Amino acid sequence: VTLTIRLLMHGKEVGSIIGKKGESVKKMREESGARINISEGNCPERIITLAGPTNAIFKAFAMIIDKLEE
Amino acid sequence: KNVTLTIRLLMHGKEVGSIIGKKGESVKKMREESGARINISEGNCPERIITLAGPTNAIFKAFAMIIDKLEE
DNA sequence: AACCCTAACCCT
Numbered sequence: 001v002t003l004t005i006r007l008l009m010h011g012k013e014v015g016s017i018i019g020k021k022g023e024s025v026k027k028m029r030e031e032s033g034a035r036i037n038i039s040e041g042n043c044p045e046r047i048i049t050l051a052g053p054t055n056a057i058f059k060a061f062a063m064i065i066d067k068l069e070e
Numbered sequence: 071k072n073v074t075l076t077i078r079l080l081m082h083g084k085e086v087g088s089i090i091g092k093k094g095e096s097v098k099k100m101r102e103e104s105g106a107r108i109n110i111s112e113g114n115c116p117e118r119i120i121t122l123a124g125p126t127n128a129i130f131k132a133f134a135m136i137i138d139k140l141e142e
Numbered sequence: 143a144a145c146c147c148t149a150a151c152c153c154t
Contacts, residue, residue, distance in 0.1 A: 001141055008078040008119065015151040022153030029154080037154065047080065054137060061133060065126055070071045 003057055007048040007064070014038060014046045016067050024067065032060035076123040079136070086110060086118045089139050096139065104132035 009017070018025045018038065029036055034056040037049040050060045081089070090097045090110060101108050106128035109121040122132045 003137060003140060005137075006080040008080055011152095012150085015149095018152050020151050022151085024151080025153050035154095038152080040152090040154085042152080054141065057137065058134070062130065065075060065077065065129060068072075068075055068077075069126055 001054075002052055003054060004049060004051045005057055005061070007050070009038075009046040009048055011042070011044055011046060013068055014048075017048070017064060028060055028063050032056050032063065034060035036060060073126070074124060075126055075129055076121060077129055077133070079120040079122070079133075081118050081120055083114075083116045083118060085140060086120070088142075089120070089136060100132055100135045104128050104135060106132040108132060 016024070017028075019027075025036060025038065028034075032050075032052070034050045034052040037047075037051075039047040039049075048064070050057050052060075088096070089100075097108060097110065100106075104124075106122050106124040109123075111119040111121075120136070122129050124132075
């Protein structure tokens with residue numbers, strides 16, 4: 001069973017999730033096995049989609065919250 | 071390094087339906103058990119926002135309960 | 143990698 005979770009993000013939060021050259025979001029894709037989409041735009045209010053089996057969603061979520069805590 | 075976070079999740083109304091539960095009993099138990107502040111945007115929408123806030127571990131506990139809810 | 147920091151990090 002694959003779940004699809006959408007988070008709402010602020011653009012500052014989003015930058016640290018992508019990281020320099022996308023190296024952070026790269027790491028997250030590889031290590032979580034979640035499909036991660038970050039809405040295209042230099043926009044003030046951004047959507048992060050996480051899709052996959054529960055373990056993948058959980059890994060990806062845990063990594064996002066570690067980024068936001070800094 | 072913040073010890074409190076706020077996460078928002080974008081949810082369809084049928085999903086919010088199961089998260090709240092009958093007489094709000096599922097979100098009551100999530101609140102009590104996670105220790106997170108859980109806000110569900112009000113009313114009748116089709117497209118609702120769930121805000122989780124509190125200690126990181128509280129966030130993660132609430133989120134798991136949300137997921138556990140959604141996969142049933 | 144550098145006298146090579148921070149503030150901003152923008153990828154599928």
